[PDB]
Amino acid sequence: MQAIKCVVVGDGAVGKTCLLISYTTNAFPGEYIPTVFDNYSANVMVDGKPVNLGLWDTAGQEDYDRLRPLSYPQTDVFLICFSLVSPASFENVRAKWYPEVRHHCPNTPIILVGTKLDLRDDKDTIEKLKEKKLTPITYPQGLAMAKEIGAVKYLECSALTQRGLKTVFDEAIRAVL
Amino acid sequence: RKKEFIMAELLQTEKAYVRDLHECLETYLWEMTSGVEEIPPGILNKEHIIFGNIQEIYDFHNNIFLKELEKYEQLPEDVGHCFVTWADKFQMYVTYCKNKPDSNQLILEHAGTFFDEIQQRHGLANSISSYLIKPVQRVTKYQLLLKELLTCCEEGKGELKDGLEVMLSVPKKANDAMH
Ligand SMILES: CCNC(=O)Nc1nccs1
Numbered sequence: 001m002q003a004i005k006c007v008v009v010g011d012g013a014v015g016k017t018c019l020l021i022s023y024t025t026n027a028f029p030g031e032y033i034p035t036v037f038d039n040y041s042a043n044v045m046v047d048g049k050p051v052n053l054g055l056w057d058t059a060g061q062e063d064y065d066r067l068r069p070l071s072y073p074q075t076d077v078f079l080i081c082f083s084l085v086s087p088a089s090f091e092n093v094r095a096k097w098y099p100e101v102r103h104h105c106p107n108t109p110i111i112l113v114g115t116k117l118d119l120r121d122d123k124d125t126i127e128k129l130k131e132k133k134l135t136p137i138t139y140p141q142g143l144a145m146a147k148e149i150g151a152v153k154y155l156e157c158s159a160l161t162q163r164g165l166k167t168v169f170d171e172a173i174r175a176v177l
Numbered sequence: 178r179k180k181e182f183i184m185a186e187l188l189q190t191e192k193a194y195v196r197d198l199h200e201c202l203e204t205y206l207w208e209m210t211s212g213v214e215e216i217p218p219g220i221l222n223k224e225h226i227i228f229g230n231i232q233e234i235y236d237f238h239n240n241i242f243l244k245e246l247e248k249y250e251q252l253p254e255d256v257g258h259c260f261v262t263w264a265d266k267f268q269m270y271v272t273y274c275k276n277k278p279d280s281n282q283l284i285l286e287h288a289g290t291f292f293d294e295i296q297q298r299h300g301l302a303n304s305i306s307s308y309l310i311k312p313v314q315r316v317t318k319y320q321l322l323l324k325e326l327l328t329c330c331e332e333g334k335g336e337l338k339d340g341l342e343v344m345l346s347v348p349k350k351a352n353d354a355m356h
Contacts, residue, residue: 031182038197041302059318060320061314064348066352066355067274070313
C-alpha cells in the first residue's frame with residue numbers, strides 16, 4: 001500500500017501547525033493552539049485507492065536555512081503555504097520557499113496553499129493591512145504565483161472554518177498518484 | 178491558563194520525544210546491533226553514521242532533562258532556567274545535525290528495504306527517517322514554546338529571556354555547523 005511523505009513549508013504566519021492539527025483532528029484546536037505537531041501518518045482512500053499519508057511539520061525551523069533541508073529528501077509532495085492576509089508570506093514563496101524546495105527536490109510536486117481564508121474578509125485584518133498600505137492576497141495572485149513556481153494546484157483554505165482543508169490534502173495525494 | 182497549557186505541551190511533548198527516541202533505539206538500532214537479521218554490507222558497523230549521537234541525546238532527556246522539566250510543572254515562568262542549567266548538553270544537537278546528511282545518504286545508497294522491512298515487521302507508523310528527523314524538530318521547537326510563555330508571563334520573565342537565548346543559540350550553532 002502506497003506510502004506518501006508530505007512536507008509543509010512556509011513562514012510562521014501561515015499557521016502550518018494549526019493547519020495540520022485542524023486537518024488531522026477535524027477541528028480547529030480553538031482554546032489553545034499547540035506549537036507541536038509530531039510527524040503523522042494515517043490511511044485515507046482517494047479516488048477509492050487507499051493511501052498512507054504521512055505529514056511532517058516544519059514550524060520552528062524558519063530561521064535555520066541549513067537545518068530545514070534535512071526534512072526535504074524523499075518527500076513525495078510539498079505544501080508551500082503563505083497566509084492570505086500576509087503579503088510578506090506570499091512574497092516569501094517566491095523568495096525563500098520555492099527556491100530551496102526546487103534546489104533540493106527538483107522533481108517533487110508542489111501544491112501552493114493560501115491559508116487563513118477566514119481572515120481575508122475580516123474588517124480588522126483588512127484595516128490593519130490598509131494601515132500598512134497593503135491588501136489581502138486574492139485568487140488571481142495565487143494562481144499567478146502557482147504558475148510561476150510550477151505548482152500543480154493553487155488552493156485556498158481555513159484551519160478555522162475547515163473550508164478547503166480536506167481538499168488540500170486530497171490534492172496533495174492526487175499530485176503523487 | 179495559557180502558561181499552564183504551554184507547560185503541559187512542553188512536558189507532554191517531551192515525554193513523547195523520549196518515547197520516540199527510545200522506540201527508535203530499541204527497534205531500528207537494536208536490529209543492527211543485535212545480530213538477529215541480514216545487515217546489508219553497505220551499512221555494516223556504520224550505525225554510528227546512521228544514528229549519530231542519538232543514544233547520548235536520548236540519555237540526556239531520559240535520565241536528566243525530562244525529570245527536571247517535570248519539576249518546573251507548576252513554575253512555567255521559571256522554566257527558562259532549566260534550559261540555562263543544561264545548556265551544554267544541548268551542544269550534542271550540534272554534532273547530530275552535522276551528521277544527518279551523511280546519515281540520510283547512507284540509508285538511501287546502501288540500506289535498501291532493510292529498515293522498511295523492520296518497520297513492516299514491528300508495525301511502526303514512523304519510518305526510520307521519520308524517527309531520525311525528530312531531534313532536529315525538537316531542538317527548534319523549544320524556542321517556540323519559550324516565546325509562547327513570554328507572551329503570557331509578567332515582569333517575572335528574565336527566567337524565560339535567558340532560556341530562550343540558549344534555545345536560539347543551539348539551533349543556530351547547529352545550523353552554522355553544516356557543510
Ligand atoms: C485565528 C485565525 N485562524 C487561523 O489560524 N486560520 C488558519 N487557516 C489555516 C491555518 S491557520
